[PDB]
């Protein structure tokens, strides 16, 4: 992922312009655009993203998710 694209995505999803993405946005995304995800799977994917359980995704957390390579 181009970091320019990452920064643009973060800006778009930071609705309050507070420097974070609220977990509600992620929940909304997974619930509405996700395909038959369970509520526990949604909570798991949220937890995978917001790693400190702050209820907000900061840019470092966002980058960790988006730019990670597991191969």
């Amino acid at each position: 992922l181009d970091e320019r694209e990452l920064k643009e995505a973060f800006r778009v999803l930071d609705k309050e312009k507070k420097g974070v993405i609220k977990v509600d946005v992620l929940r909304w995304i997974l619930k509405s655009l996700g395909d038959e995800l369970t509520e526990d799977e949604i909570e798991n994917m949220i937890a995978e993203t917001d790693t400190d359980g702050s209820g907000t995704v900061d840019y470092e957390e966002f980058k960790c998710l988006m730019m990670s390579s597991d191969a």
Binding site: E8, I29, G34, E41, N44, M45, E48, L65, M66
Partner: peptide
């Protein structure tokens, strides 16, 4: 941990939403 299917879906959906919202 997340399975790669779920992690890939998560990343895909996040980007789709960003693209959608940019568009209005």
């Amino acid at each position: 941990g997340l399975s790669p299917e779920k992690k890939k879906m998560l990343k895909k959906l996040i980007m789709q939403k960003a693209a959608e919202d940019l568009a209005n």
